[PDB]
């Protein structure tokens, strides 16, 4: 839960999962970028955010 | 093993210390250790079972960290923590059961289950913390080749054996001389009998001797010596040596004479006790030598003299007993005893799931056969399963 | 209970750890817990003991907190802490004594003394901290209704009873067949006797059976089985079943034949042991069935043959024994054992103050009556008083 | 003793908790306490040994402190800590052994070895921390002059004594009335016998009484009482009181009648049980009075009547027995027992180094002599050596 | 179980309260709970199992919420609500049936069907609301370790047994003395008969006693006691004990004498009623002891004197009987009774779908065997299935 | 014991040396020790126990300091000193009697009476002086 993560300030678990490539789901109202470029999909930019 | 023990102790401390209303300062370090364990275990897949009737169970860890409270814990905190604690306790119990039902002739001290082999990887060493139990302490010492020690109350060190030896006999079994003994658990009950009451024995003394070889060295042992062996103090009918016939025993108990208990280590006398009954200390020994004597009383009242004629028949047979009880001792190897439940737990787990007999332990985990042939391989496997059993007993 | 145990645990920790010269870092959390206890208990009036000869004690708490500025504990700090600890330990001892002398037929697991009732309020829950003892752990698990477990060394599970059963008898009592047993504590000694030594038996085998029904289920039990029963192996004069007369027993011990120990749960076989002596494991059971045979030896030496004639009179009576000892076990319910002193503590407290017989417990805490009629309400009250006894033993003992 | 115990506890905690991979949060306070111990012990010279064959050893303390900046302990930290832990453990074991082999008459509670006397200085109290063990707790209570308490499973309270008393006797020992007993460990078996089966008794009842005086007050004691003494229920030949001759005993067991067991404190009745067998509780006592009766059966079957004739000879001798076993107890004074191992440890250390007999304890640390004459001086020395033995057992 | 009960109660309330024309204020909270249940259940897949002939059924929840903006409910609202209520009721009924046809030995109180196990997760706890029914209230109280009881009208506590005991008999069965009884459900009938009419009995009184051991403790029990057993008041031909032959019983009913009905708990007389007939109260008991006496009438008219001669033959046999009916009671454990339909519902569901015999309950859910060997496991499973049966009965 | 002995020694020295007409130089150290004892004992409550027929006695200490500034001690000084000394001597005698009638099997060298146990506290160590007997 991104709200709980923001409030606590403890990023130990999220950092450990991002570093170790552990599948997760970040839940919370989020703004998103709508990318229509196929080359962006090939470049895998969605994983760089 | 250290990682499994650390998981189990972390979960036990979580159950005991994460209670409603408790100060967060009382569990700060415990919560830190628990969160470290959650981090280390998250994202890992474990599999348990697949032997006997033990079901195949898959364990996935996707738990969030335990939170913090300013002053005291509340009910919400306790329930949230308890869900995770329950899942982890189930996982640990299943892993311990999986490890208890396995054995290996080669490298029996090493983990046998896939889950415990995975837990022995470097990534899980983070979970390792305080190793204060007796069994885990001895496990760590044995890993380092340091001197180990297990304290037993009434150690199960003597395999059951109710036997006898006839030093003098004949097919009619009417003038017999010998010794009959029961070595059961922590108890020795020996009795030397002479049907003639040492009438023709030189100096009217008949010498009886019983040597018991312990399969492991016992140190710092408290032993109770009592003059009489109540087990062999009443009349009975005893099979022959080959079972071809039965003979009759009709004890009349006399005080054992010149009693000598020798506790020996590697053929060297370590302790000697002469005519000493009650509590004695055998500091370090692997052999017990009880040498006693039947002495014909030089003076007898008419009733006593009527029982011991100059010649046959001998209707009343003189007997001198001896009872030895190891109340407590210390052994470098794991043994069953009256106070602990490790053997019982391992046997129960093996029986419940119908574990087929392996290549190490005797069928049914029978203790007499196990201690009779207590090989170093058996010692390693039994120590492993006993340590896992204690780890499981922490939780279950 | 949790609050009372937490008080006792905090006081024991304070006694053990608040010592002269110790680093404050060794007791910082303990000092905070102690101060929390002082704050929570301050301003409260308690009363303990109005039953039997237990005196009425009134308790007031107005104490200052322990200092937290020290880096090493000195003499004066320890003395003040010890004075406060002594008062609190007296209070906890009296509360435990008051709770141990009470029983309820309805909600025996709930607190009975008004002091513990007061401590069961929300404001006192802050005192709660580590519940690591075996009894308090089992208390919490039972409250949540999780699977409990009490480990007993030599569990006192068999109510005392020494009796005999005569399958064959007659007014002369010169040709008897039957069994005599003693089921006491953790021990069963049984012995089947035939006066005729199965001379006229179907193949010279006499079958004896003993059924012992435990009042509670025992799990993970280590049991020593020995072939001979030394209690029933010497001459005896036994009063008859009606008590009218007495009969003579003159046993000559023969080894038991086809020994079979069966451990059953709900009448279903859990463990079976045939001709196995020594240490055995009964993993889960509530009934023990010991079936053993007296077999006439087909071949006898002249003396043995002289013992057993083809017909009466029979002066030597064949006997086959069995000894069963539960060295240790696990039970979901509290029990008296040779290692713990919970029953002794409760009985001592009750007798010391002449507590009148209540509607729940036996007439004086007689364990034989209690275990014979170990009812669910008795179980609840017994667990409550045993937990209180352990809490008290943490401090008074 | 508190400083020695604190050293031992710190070293045990260092062994258990300073392990590879553990969070520094798990050992932060322990590392601080260990460093405090290093600081306090540094620059000090100790000497142990010099009594018996115990070798004289010299101990110097110049050790660096452990690190405090790690997040998780690694191999290097563990080895660095282990070197110092090994040296300190050796020092503590040697100090404990040196103290265990020494005794004093007037002030046996005070430290005897110069090492422990040096450790009793004020400057060493900084090492002092958690004293949670039962024996150290009782040591501190004794030092504060508070009420002490030791729990014993099967307390070794009765010195061994197998004796008899003949209230009716003749030179031929054919019409004997009396009682024979064994008081061993936590067990008291007694048996009152009448050769005439009380035929000529006033009410055909023979009264038997056994008084056993405990050398220390036992409280919260759980006891098992059974109505037969198996020890004195089989025929035997017993020397006469002066050893001049031997007499014959041929028991036939009848149930004891009007059984009354009374537990007395300072000659005052504390507990009393009549016709009660099984588990009983003696809450506070130092003496036991067992009174039972042999009642001649008013009605007898032909065989029973054949056993007991109107006059002599009396070939079958009526006997009534009692067994009293103390399973658990609480005592203000230290005692040997089955579960613990302090007596065994002290005796082992004294035997292994051939300690000359001192002015306090009996030769060879024989428990029967110790408890028969359990004087306050002996109690002081025994508490000191038992506490030292437990401290040593924490490590060895 | 609480979530399943909450589903059932919500659907029952929806059926009862969502009616055409009703003010929305009458169902505001009910509609809020219904929408909460919809939200919680939406997006979840459930499966009710195929045990026996019960079909495998898959359940999906993608329902929209109910409107909350009408002043009065109309036909459209009722129809729309009913469309969802029907599906939810079908799901609840199938889950209840799946749970009723399952039993476990290790943990019979925990949910057995996978659907109810899924509903026991945290995510469904939101569905939980008012738990007012007696069975769910008892379930919750028992989960809280609180004293709770079920009230039974004519509790089915006595297993069926028609039997007799002959204290005096002979192969010809002409001079018999003994007792006859039937214990069926909540009803006991006993009748002590003497063929001689106590002509030779000491003081012309024959004593009969009947002990009925209840398998569970009953409290606050109203009991009707009547002085005659009509069941054993007419001529009968009765098989022998071994069935070898048949004997004749020809009762002539006399008033029972010295009637004492004792209600005992743990062997202590909680309640006693002497010569009292009609309504009596047994506050708390687990055993019933009925003592009565056949007293020969001291004065007999010629017609009466003709019935009872001084010696055989005895053609009229004097009988005295008692009848004890438990009108109402309270029990900690569940029981069958004359008013509730739980046993009938569980048995019907098991019979309809041909559920095989399990390891806990007897075949066909026979209540005599069930109440005879009322083990704790049977009690747990029976309470679980009875609670599920009541939950289902709210809807079906 | 050392504190009790020091109390008794101070009181005996006060009785012997605080006499009318004596130079203050003969008692200067004695007066300082006496005032030290008064300050140490002031504000302390003591109880000599009721073992046997020995009466239960309660002792309270609130006394003024002995004066300085006298070249030769006069009668008023001796009177005040005698009052204080008499009370202290009664206290010391009762404490000694209470201790003389008590015994313990173990730790019999330690103080038995509550008064002597209280006097064994650190705060009373100031009273200790010359132990010459
Ligand atoms: Cl034991
Ligand atoms: Zn032979
Ligand atoms: Zn034991
Ligand atoms: Zn009989
Ligand atoms: Zn003699
Ligand atoms: Zn019949």
UniProtKB/Swiss-Prot annotation, chain C:
It is found in: Virion. Ca(2+) binds at residues 266, 286. Keywords: Calcium, Capsid protein, Intermediate capsid protein, Metal-binding, Ubl conjugation, Virion, Zinc. One of its GO terms (molecular function) is metal ion binding. InterPro entries: Capsid_hemagglutn, Rotavirus_A/C_VP6, Virus_capsid_a-hlx_vir. The N-terminus is blocked. GO terms for biological process: fusion of virus membrane with host plasma membrane. Zn(2+) binds at residue 153. One of its GO terms (cellular component) is viral intermediate capsid. Intermediate capsid protein that self assembles to form an icosahedral capsid with a T=13 symmetry, which consists of 230 trimers of VP6, with channels at each of its five-fold vertices. This capsid constitutes the middle concentric layer of the viral mature particle. The innermost VP2 capsid and the intermediate VP6 capsid remain intact following cell entry to protect the dsRNA from degradation and to prevent unfavorable antiviral responses in the host cell during all the replication cycle of the virus. Belongs to the rotavirus VP6 family. The VP6 trimer contains a zinc ion located at the center of the molecule. The zinc ion is not essential for either trimerization or transcription activity of the DLP. Zinc-depleted VP6 has an increased sensitivity to proteases. This is Intermediate capsid protein VP6.
């Amino acid at each position: 839960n991104l709200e709980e993560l923001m409030r606590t300030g403890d990023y130990a678990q999220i950092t450990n999962m991002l570093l170790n490539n552990q599948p997760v789901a970040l839940v919370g109202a989020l703004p998103f970028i709508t990318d229509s470029s196929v080359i962006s999909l090939v470049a895998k930019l969605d994983a760089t955010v | 093993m250290d990682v499994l023990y650390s998981l189990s102790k972390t979960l036990k401390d979580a159950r005991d210390k994460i209670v409603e209303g408790t100060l967060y300062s009382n569990v700060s370090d415990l919560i830190q250790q628990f969160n470290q364990m959650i981090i280390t275990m998250n994202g890992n897949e474990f599999q348990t079972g697949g032997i006997g009737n033990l079901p195949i169970r898959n364990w996935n860890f996707d738990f969030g960290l335990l939170g913090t409270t300013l002053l005291n814990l509340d009910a919400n905190y306790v329930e949230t923590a308890r869900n995770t604690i329950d899942y982890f306790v189930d996982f640990v119990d299943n892993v311990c059961m999986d490890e208890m039902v396995r054995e290996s002739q080669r490298n029996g001290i090493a983990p046998q289950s896939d889950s415990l082999r995975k837990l022995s990887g470097i990534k899980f060493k983070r979970i390792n913390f305080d190793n204060s139990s007796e069994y885990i302490e001895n496990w760590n010492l044995q890993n380092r080749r340091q001197r180990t020690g297990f304290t037993f109350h009434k150690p199960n060190i003597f395999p059951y054996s109710a036997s006898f030896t006839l030093n003098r006999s004949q097919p009619a079994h009417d003038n017999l001389m010998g010794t009959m003994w029961l070595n059961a658990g922590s108890e020795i009950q020996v009795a030397g009998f002479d049907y003639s009451c040492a009438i023709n024995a030189p100096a009217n003394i008949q010498q009886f001797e019983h040597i018991v070889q312990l399969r492991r060295v016992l140190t710092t042992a408290t032993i109770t010596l009592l003059p009489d062996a109540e087990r062999f103090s009443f009349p009975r009918v005893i099979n022959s040596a080959d079972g071809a016939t039965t003979w009759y025993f009709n004890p009349v108990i006399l005080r054992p004479n010149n009693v000598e208990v020798e506790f020996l280590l590697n053929g060297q006398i370590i302790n000697t006790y002469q005519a000493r009954f009650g509590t004695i200390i055998a500091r370090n020994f692997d052999t017990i030598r009880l040498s006693f004597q039947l002495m014909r009383p030089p003076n007898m009242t008419p009733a006593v003299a009527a029982l011991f004629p100059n010649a046959q028949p001998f209707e009343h047979h003189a007997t001198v007993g001896l009872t030895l009880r190891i109340e407590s001792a210390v052994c470098e190897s794991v043994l069953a005893d009256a106070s602990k439940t490790m053997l019982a737990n391992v046997t129960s787990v093996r029986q419940e799931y119908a574990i087929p007999v392996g290549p190490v332990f005797p069928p049914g985990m029978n203790w007499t056969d196990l201690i009779t042939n207590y090989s170093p391989s058996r010692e390693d496997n039994l120590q492993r399963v006993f340590t896992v059993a204690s780890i499981r007993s922490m939780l279950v």
